[PDB]
Design a binder for this molecule. Structure first.
Ligand SMILES: C[C@H](C(=O)O)c1ccc(C(=O)c2cccs2)cc1
Length: 581
């Protein structure tokens, strides 16, 4: 019978350890590494016991519960992690819910800092196993929903970079570009998974199902509806699980799904060839991001099945999900150029037209132009991508982030500074990722990445709500979030923040920051300016940041750093007020 044995045997020891360290780092984000390693040994030992006897030890119990019992075993928790000991005194299947609800999307943690190359390679040389325990633990605690088996994949890429670079001439010059690139992939991965989890948990299984139906219909245009559907069903269970902290099950299930798709690759995509050769993680990663197969030629016009067919209303009425799944499949596989959110928006339009029209005396006369009515929904996002790409190319990264920071702060000034600056910085990454593709490739690139970034604002804001406008964009339809945020003008009801000296007065710590961190400091300041003076002009703002820049250059090459900051700090505070009013 025993679950931990089945799972142990299934994913094998190596992945088993990692998934259990991930599980523990996800539930208990503030515990020291050394504490988590012990919980993992104690759990590994148990599975190698349930390897012997199916009835030998606690092997009868659900995984939810083996994790349950291990946390509360050390009451050391009640103190630094005594908020969720409220959960330890409760029971299943109600307890494990308490645990999951306290996952902190923004734990109070210093940044994961990366050591000098010499030092990082030394740590990896001395103890490799400890090294990647540390890594899984530092990423998973900071991103409590990261897609667990993709995390394993990234650990493995990370080790391949240290192997290549640690013996090198200049270790730094070899590591830095490669780590920085790996880090960016992992952030995007974390943001995509957080979106799946939020769709599932906040808007229901169906909302991710539809999303995954569209995306897989674009990716695998030749595969038939019943196959896509089967893939959509299994991938739903996969992410429902991972999103719920059932990582052993998720990893195992995701493996069967990779296997099933390779074993049936003939009738899915020719591009599956690239993936099916590969060892497990590499294979499932490859699948998970495969570029779109080409559209089969000779498909009938979509109007035949969805406008002229005499059973349109009977289909919609008698089997709604089946019929509208088909609409999504058919429409999406033929539109790799559209974003997922757009396609879902067309689904919603089509459905609302049917609902309304099929309840009239003459449904056909009412819905005949439904596909033609998609045009203005297609044009809004295409226009926006184009205007914003020209702005990106015109201003460059930093000034584009600046313009979005100003626009967003005026939009939702109640939002906290670190969130506004994070969210603006992500918005400017989209310019860089996407505006170099030709016109046709741009929309799915931009709009799908916007989803991920808006979701990130929505999860942060859910924790501590402060803006009615965010809450509204974030909780109405998932698929309208981008248009919803787009349509917000400046919030003219916000009462400007008091002028606040220490949010504007600077100290010598700051001189140690690399230029990239100084940018964030300039950008944090700009946000506080816009909060203080929401009608400030772009020239006003450029002049205050300009002064900030001069203060920094000046006091950062002083021998007496604290005392130049004292002479100049308050002289900035005084020139800011003057420029601003
Ligand atoms: C949702 C938000 C907004 O306008 O408030 C938004 C909308 C569109 C874009 C946009 O089109 C681009 C960003 C980067 C390159 S193009 C950026 C941000």
């Amino acid at each position: 019978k025993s679950e931990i044995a089945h799972r142990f045997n299934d994913v094998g020891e190596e992945h088993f350890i990692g998934l259990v360290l991930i599980t523990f780092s996800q539930y208990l984000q503030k515990c020291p590494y050394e504490e988590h390693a012990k919980l993992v040994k104690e759990v590994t030992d148990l599975a190698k016991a349930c390897v012997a006897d199916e009835s030998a030890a606690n092997c009868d119990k659900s995984l939810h519960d083996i994790f349950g019992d291990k946390i509360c075993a050390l009451p050391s928790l009640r103190d630094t992690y005594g908020d969720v000991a409220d959960c330890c005194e409760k029971k299943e299947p109600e307890r494990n819910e308490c645990f999951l609800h306290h996952k902190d999307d923004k734990p109070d943690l210093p940044p994961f800092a990366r050591p000098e190359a010499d030092v990082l390679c030394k740590a990896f040389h001395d103890d490799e196993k400890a090294f990647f325990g540390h890594y899984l633990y530092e990423v998973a605690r900071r991103h409590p929903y990261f897609y667990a088996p993709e995390l394993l994949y990234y650990a493995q890429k990370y080790k391949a970079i240290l192997t290549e670079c640690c013996e090198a001439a200049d270790k730094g010059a070899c590591l830095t570009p490669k780590l920085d690139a790996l880090k960016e992939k992992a952030l995007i991965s974390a943001a995509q998974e957080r979106l799946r989890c939020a769709s599932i948990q906040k808007f229901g299984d169906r909302a991710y199902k539809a999303w995954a139906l569209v995306r897989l219909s674009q990716r695998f245009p030749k595969a038939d509806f019943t196959d896509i559907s089967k893939i959509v069903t299994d991938l739903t269970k996969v992410h429902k699980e991972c999103c719920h902290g059932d990582l052993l099950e998720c990893a195992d299930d995701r493996a069967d799904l990779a296997k099933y798709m390779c074993e049936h690759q003939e009738t899915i995509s020719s591009h599956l060839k690239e993936c099916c050769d590969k060892p497990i993680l590499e294979k499932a990663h490859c699948i998970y991001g495969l570029h779109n197969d080409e559209t089969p030629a000779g498909l009938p016009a979509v109007a035949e099945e969805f406008v002229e067919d005499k059973d349109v209303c009977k289909n919609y009425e008698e089997a709604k999900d089946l019929f509208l799944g088909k609409f999504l499949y058919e429409y999406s596989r033929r539109h790799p150029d559209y974003s997922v959110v757009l396609l879902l928006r067309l689904g919603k339009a089509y459905e609302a037209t049917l609902k309304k029209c099929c309840a009239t005396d003459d449904p056909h006369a009412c819905y005949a132009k439904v596909l033609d009515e998609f045009q203005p929904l297609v044009d809004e996002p295409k226009n926006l991508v184009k205007q914003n790409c020209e702005l990106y190319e015109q201003l460059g990264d930093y000034n584009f982030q600046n313009a979005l920071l100003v626009r967003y702060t005026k939009k939702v000034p109640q939002v906290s500074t670190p969130t506004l600056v994070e969210i603006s910085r992500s918005l400017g990454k989209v310019g860089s990722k996407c505006c170099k593709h030709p016109e046709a490739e741009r929309l799915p690139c931009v709009e799908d990445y916007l989803s991920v970034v808006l979701n990130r604002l929505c999860v942060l804001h859910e924790k501590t709500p402060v803006s009615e406008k965010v809450t509204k964009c974030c909780s109405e339809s998932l698929v309208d979030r981008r248009p919803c945020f787009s349509a917000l003008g400046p919030d003219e009801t916000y009462v400007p923040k008091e002028f606040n000296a220490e949010t504007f007065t600077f100290h010598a710590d700051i001189c140690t920051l690399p230029e990239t961190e100084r940018k964030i400091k300039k950008q944090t300041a700009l946000v506080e300016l816009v909060k203080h003076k929401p009608h400030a002009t772009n020239d006003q703002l450029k002049t205050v940041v300009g002064e900030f820049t001069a203060l920094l250059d000046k006091c950062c090459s002083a021998e007496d750093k604290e005392a130049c900051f004292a002479v100049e700090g308050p002289k900035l505070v005084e020139s800011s007020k003057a420029t601003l009013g």
